[PDB]
Amino acid sequence: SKGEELFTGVVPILVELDGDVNGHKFSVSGEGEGDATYGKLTLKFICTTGKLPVPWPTLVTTFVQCFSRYPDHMKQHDFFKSAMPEGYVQERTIFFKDDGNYKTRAEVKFEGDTLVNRIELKGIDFKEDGNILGHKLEYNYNSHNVYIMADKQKNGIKVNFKIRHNIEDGSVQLADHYQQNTPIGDGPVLLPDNHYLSTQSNLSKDPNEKRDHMVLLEFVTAAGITASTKKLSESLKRIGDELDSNMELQRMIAAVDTDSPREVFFRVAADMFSDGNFNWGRVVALFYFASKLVL
Amino acid sequence: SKGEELFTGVVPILVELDGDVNGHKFSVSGEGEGDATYGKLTLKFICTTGKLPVPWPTLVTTFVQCFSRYPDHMKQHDFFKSAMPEGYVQERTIFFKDDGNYKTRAEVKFEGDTLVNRIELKGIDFKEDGNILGHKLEYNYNSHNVYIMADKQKNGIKVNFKIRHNIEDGSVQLADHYQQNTPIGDGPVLLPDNHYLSTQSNLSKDPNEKRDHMVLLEFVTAAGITASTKKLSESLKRIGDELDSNMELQRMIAAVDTDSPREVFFRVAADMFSDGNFNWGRVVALFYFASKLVL
Amino acid sequence: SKGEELFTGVVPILVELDGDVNGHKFSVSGEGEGDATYGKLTLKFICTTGKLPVPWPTLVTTFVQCFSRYPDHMKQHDFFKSAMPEGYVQERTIFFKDDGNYKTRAEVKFEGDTLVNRIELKGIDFKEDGNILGHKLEYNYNSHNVYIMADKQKNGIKVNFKIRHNIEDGSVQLADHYQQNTPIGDGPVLLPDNHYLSTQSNLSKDPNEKRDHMVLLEFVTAAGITASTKKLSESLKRIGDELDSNMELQRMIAAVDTDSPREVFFRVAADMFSDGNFNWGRVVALFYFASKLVL
Amino acid sequence: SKGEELFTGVVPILVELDGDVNGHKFSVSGEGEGDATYGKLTLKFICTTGKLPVPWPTLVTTFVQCFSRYPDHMKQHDFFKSAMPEGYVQERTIFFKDDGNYKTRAEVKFEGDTLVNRIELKGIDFKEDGNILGHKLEYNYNSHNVYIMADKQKNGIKVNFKIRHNIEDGSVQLADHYQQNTPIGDGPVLLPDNHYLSTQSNLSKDPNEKRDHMVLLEFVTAAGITASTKKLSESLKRIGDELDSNMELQRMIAAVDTDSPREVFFRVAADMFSDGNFNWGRVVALFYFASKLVL
């Protein structure tokens, strides 16, 4: 990629956000630098509209995956960099469980020597007493894996992952992310095989800063890419897939009386084997059953 | 059934067989009595043509399942008795693994007070040094479950099971039995739900008999019958069924290099999860894989 | 053994019993014959004192394990025959679960050509509405493995096994059998390695008998014998043994609140691994725990 | 703790090392700052003796666990801070697998407003062609958990963990760390319950620095602390412990012929059950066996 030659050495980063969550508007400006070579990000965010409506941790993901470190044997699956300097568009939808959602659209591109992230975000359906709008999130972060996948039809990628937020009672607010990327530029881009980005982050405060702010450090590394063994697991995939997605079956098992579970399994077991034609397929399909007799 | 009333008390039994195994002909006459009340059978067999060309054990199953004890709660799934006194026809095929086969047709019915089994048997493809024609079966028997299933279209029953014959070196000769029963009469019969007959047997000699003979003692008891739980396992059945019968998949897995198996599993495991979308279906489909990495 | 030569061919059998069950006395005489060559037993029992106070099935085991077929490779671990013609003494205790017990002593030996079993039986602690004294046993039998073990110190054998009696409601009455055999004679006997007798049995009536009777048919075959591999499993034995018998632990686990079980396991799991020193021993000891979180 | 009040707000850090590895001497000086409040470390190392004998990654651990972030419910198990300002002594031994070892002794204490780490390190027995002295380690790092444990007898703590180093061929150099801490000061210190430190690190280069150097960013958080459920798992611990440490047994199983493994298991299985006294203990002890029939 021609983009790859932009990401050697420390690059300056600048970030602009306009947010709107349950009619709370707000703006964030961020600056810093990223070192792709060692998969390193450092960024400072100032709330430019006063205090922040939402907790800081909720925005970490919204606020540069072109600064991930790609190992040499992988560097031909780096879509992010390959899209530069013209850049890409990053659209996400973020479902917090039992609560509202964000919908974002960013343009990431180069404006001279600087890499800028320009974001519009729009939250709705939050619960005034919830984890978000109640500010019950802990000022911290965890590590996640960012499964990428090509979208050869739309010349971009499809991304998905699930962020865990800590809360003070020990519980964990889930944040189901559905992401999609697409080149603003007309030039060709790398369209990757399935792999992931292993992310780690910590959140801190500057002690000579009195406005509402977050100091964000990100670590990012690409991974998950090491025959005909390929062709085999593609099938094992679909067989377990059609299985877990077979709406007939899922409905059928949910619909069962399992307060007195022990009898229910045994009779269904013995009913399966009334024709007495045992094969490993049934041993397993009944072990998916005895499996499902847990949750 | 009206047939049931004929099988209270001890019934005299008469058995006639005409055989041909690799162009070896032979005949067998058997007499004894049967007690369906306590599922009991005693029979003596004389070879009327000199010595027997096959081992006695191979002939036990060929040589009255209307003498099975049906527990009270089952007596309506008793097909065999219900077809009497007019009778039924019992056709089998018997694949000795790695070896020849028997193809039988027998008419079982009443002739006055006696219950007669009249048999023609035809064996082809045995090995002149095999387990049968070489006579390497031990003079004994083991216990087996005889799975029955209605055949509503043919007004009879399908039957299948698998006899294990002991051999001297400790190994075991399989005898895959494929059976079917059909009423000679036009009267109505009973068409059973899936159940099974639990058979136990012992083979002996009479010490005042000098002709080639077998003394056969059989015990036979029906079993395997105790909702919407029915409808559920019908599906679990087919899902494990299509699975084990999916010729694509079976071919695919057989076609794999498993002398160095440990790597093969792990990479296929990690290839399945390169898109990192885990669901129990795949956990199980890969546990059918790691399963199959045994035989 | 010289005893073995007495058990070729059909031997006449005679059986005498004197009983006392909850102050109910009774007597039983049985005659038949035994064929050790094909492990075969046929016996008829008359109640000489009118009706029987107990169900017939309870008495089957009390009512000739010297008629078991020992395969050629085993015939040196045949204790029963080797003690003949002088004989042996067979003492049992029989705990019906949730119920009374039989304490028997029998002398089995030859008196000329006949093999006699002479029995005194004494039952206490039954329930006047129980499974026995209430007569709720079904007139049938199941198949059992009779584990034998040498008792080199007492020049005899220890024996133990567990009979399952069928009852009408579908439940099953256990009969925990604790046996021991000891030669009346001074001659040398055979002291067996661990093996077992595979028994199968059927109970019936004679239709020209008007007195209270049982017709008993037994099949009995020795089995369970095929290095330094011996020495290994002796240890695996004790390790699982001390484990299951460790009264500290058994008490400890029984003493746990498992109405809300899911949390209990996880915390104990995480408490085991707070020092974070994982080894397979703990993976297994916790898999004995998660195991025990079932019954 | 009185030490806790020293670690609010950004503290300056200064590090001195004198190393000697296979007669290669060297010196490292490091400076930077740590923010305990958010479990954050930033440090720069300059090689003051020229080029470095050993790879940079090998020293990360040697080069401030008093800057870990302790959650409020844990802050009474913070030994590190409690030992301040007088400080503690940190002794480690580091076994790299299939290669040499480091032995270190540091004094960590306050010298005015600064937290200084003073280190003597001494490596021996490395292989001139190895992963270390050959420089085959990758300039990166992974995440680890740092299991702490009190040593109430020696008024300090015992620490242990296992660092994985990446190598270019995809393989992983292990670094078994055995650590121990002890107050230079005579004042009392907190002696913790079992918990761990979750560490994450990345390694980078300053682009305006021409001497041999590492930029080290560490993230550190305490965790692993959430009844009578305590007392239970203490036992499950020892039972799986004595088990995995029982040298009799471990020797015994290693000593077995497992090129033809299938027979070996089955016979040992059948030998365990020749007395036919099944209990869950043996089911598990044999499932530790069938377990061990893998590696």
mmCIF file of C-alpha atoms in Angstrom, chain A residues 15-20 24-31 43-56 59 63 135 139 205 209-215:
data_model
loop_
_atom_site.group_PDB
_atom_site.id
_atom_site.type_symbol
_atom_site.label_atom_id
_atom_site.label_comp_id
_atom_site.label_asym_id
_atom_site.label_seq_id
_atom_site.Cartn_x
_atom_site.Cartn_y
_atom_site.Cartn_z
ATOM 1 C CA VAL A 15 -10.223 14.902 16.743
ATOM 2 C CA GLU A 16 -13.593 16.758 16.426
ATOM 3 C CA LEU A 17 -16.914 15.448 17.865
ATOM 4 C CA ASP A 18 -20.512 16.834 17.819
ATOM 5 C CA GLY A 19 -22.816 14.801 20.069
ATOM 6 C CA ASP A 20 -26.545 14.674 20.792
ATOM 7 C CA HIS A 24 -28.205 16.677 25.397
ATOM 8 C CA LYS A 25 -25.904 18.300 22.899
ATOM 9 C CA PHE A 26 -22.127 18.546 23.457
ATOM 10 C CA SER A 27 -18.773 18.946 21.727
ATOM 11 C CA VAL A 28 -15.356 17.359 22.167
ATOM 12 C CA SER A 29 -11.971 18.346 20.706
ATOM 13 C CA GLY A 30 -9.015 16.001 20.950
ATOM 14 C CA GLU A 31 -5.333 16.231 20.078
ATOM 15 C CA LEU A 43 -4.788 11.434 23.007
ATOM 16 C CA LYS A 44 -6.218 14.235 25.136
ATOM 17 C CA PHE A 45 -9.844 15.212 25.119
ATOM 18 C CA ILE A 46 -11.311 18.474 26.385
ATOM 19 C CA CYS A 47 -15.059 18.949 26.744
ATOM 20 C CA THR A 48 -15.528 22.263 24.857
ATOM 21 C CA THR A 49 -19.173 22.716 25.912
ATOM 22 C CA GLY A 50 -18.698 22.442 29.685
ATOM 23 C CA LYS A 51 -19.429 19.193 31.535
ATOM 24 C CA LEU A 52 -20.100 15.984 29.696
ATOM 25 C CA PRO A 53 -23.646 14.535 29.539
ATOM 26 C CA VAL A 54 -22.421 10.942 29.201
ATOM 27 C CA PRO A 55 -19.602 9.151 31.065
ATOM 28 C CA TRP A 56 -16.178 9.447 29.473
ATOM 29 C CA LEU A 59 -16.811 7.331 23.980
ATOM 30 C CA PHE A 63 -12.760 8.737 19.610
ATOM 31 C CA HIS A 135 -23.145 8.000 35.498
ATOM 32 C CA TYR A 139 -13.424 5.476 35.056
ATOM 33 C CA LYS A 205 -6.541 12.690 34.272
ATOM 34 C CA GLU A 209 -6.300 20.627 33.546
ATOM 35 C CA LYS A 210 -9.468 21.983 35.111
ATOM 36 C CA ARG A 211 -11.952 21.568 32.250
ATOM 37 C CA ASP A 212 -13.780 18.215 31.844
ATOM 38 C CA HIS A 213 -11.234 15.940 30.176
ATOM 39 C CA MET A 214 -9.956 12.425 29.481
ATOM 40 C CA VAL A 215 -6.350 11.300 28.870
#
